[PDB]
Ligand binder design. Structure first.
Ligand SMILES: O=C(O)C[C@@H]1CC[C@H](NC(=O)Cc2cccs2)[B-](O)(O)O1
Ligand SMILES: O=C(O)C[C@@H]1CC[C@H](NC(=O)Cc2cccs2)B(O)O1
Ligand SMILES: [K+]
Length: 263
């Protein structure tokens, strides 16, 4: 079937000229709303959640892991490093790298998380360990954001990412203190106010991770605590036909507004 919400998302997509993917889980009843929910999209910086979570999982058996210093060298800087560049020729702890990757979208920080996990495949292995058979990370920063149409590298589906984000933040994929740390980090994101957040009532609380890539790829994955009801998990992925397309965070806000109006 096609619901009223799905028809509105299709109209938004048609007007946008791009390709939109949405997955909602409403934990009030465990129901789902999907739009292109099983199509693949390039994750771009939303992949930073999986990398940080994989390090949190490692930290469950190493009380000092998050305090471990990691050297930052001039050669480690890439294309977007606002936190890591302040620590060149110094160090950042794994907690600092996680916070920088999640809350500031720092790409050097992400590369250090990936390296701590043994490369992109270590992030994929963690996804598999927590029940996600869809996610794949294949490259480091910055090339994981090329977002080429039809390329399977560094992709997932909306359905898979919503399920995984639920298990990480509201379920038991992580230990209790690690889940709480991930939620704290997401709630302190600096980059999200134009994306899913912008389509929701102002009284609701959001923790999210955005991403930007080539092909105008504009993404957001969020946990949402609405006023008066159980939490939601919402993924909104958007990608466009031209490599140089502009970001369209407003489309994500519009998708979130349609979802919220359908509850
Ligand atoms: O064109 C130029 O004169 C050089 C630019 C300068 C900085 C650029 N980097 C970014 O803007 C980081 C991003 C943040 C969010 C989306 S991209 B670049 O390193 O790509 O090259
Ligand atoms: O969180 C955000 O919205 C911003 C954040 C910026 C860093 C990452 N993007 C890039 O490095 C851009 C690239 C495009 C092609 C190659 S690199 B990420 O996907 O998004
Ligand atoms: K792993």
């Amino acid at each position: 079937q096609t619901s009223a919400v799905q028809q509105k998302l299709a109209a938004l997509e048609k007007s946008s000229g791009g390709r939109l993917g949405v997955a909602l889980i409403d934990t009030a009843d465990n129901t789902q709303v999907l739009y292109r929910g099983d199509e693949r999209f390039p994750m771009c910086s939303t992949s930073k959640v999986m990398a940080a979570a994989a390090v949190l999982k490692q930290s469950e058996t190493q009380k000092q892991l998050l305090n471990q210093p990691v050297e930052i060298k001039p050669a480690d800087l890439v294309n977007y490093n606002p936190i890591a560049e302040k620590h060149v020729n110094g160090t950042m702890t794994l907690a600092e790298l996680s916070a920088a990757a999640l809350q500031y979208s720092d790409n050097t920080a992400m590369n250090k998380l990936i390296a701590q996990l043994g490369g992109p495949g270590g992030v994929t292995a963690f996804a598999r360990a927590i029940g996600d058979e869809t996610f794949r990370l294949d490259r480091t920063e910055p090339t994981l954001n090329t977002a080429i149409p039809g390329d399977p590298r560094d992709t997932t589906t909306p359905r898979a990412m919503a399920q995984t984000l639920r298990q990480l933040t509201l379920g038991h994929a992580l230990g209790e203190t690690q889940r709480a740390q991930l939620v704290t980090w997401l709630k302190g994101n600096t980059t999200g106010a134009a994306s899913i957040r912008a389509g929701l009532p102002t009284s609701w609380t959001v923790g999210d991770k955005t991403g930007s890539g080539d092909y105008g790829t504009t993404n957001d994955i969020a946990v949402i605590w609405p006023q008066g009801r159980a939490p939601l998990v919402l993924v909104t992925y958007f990608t466009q036909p031209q490599q140089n397309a502009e970001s369209r965070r407003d489309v994500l806000a519009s998708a979130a507004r349609i979802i919220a109006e359908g509850l």
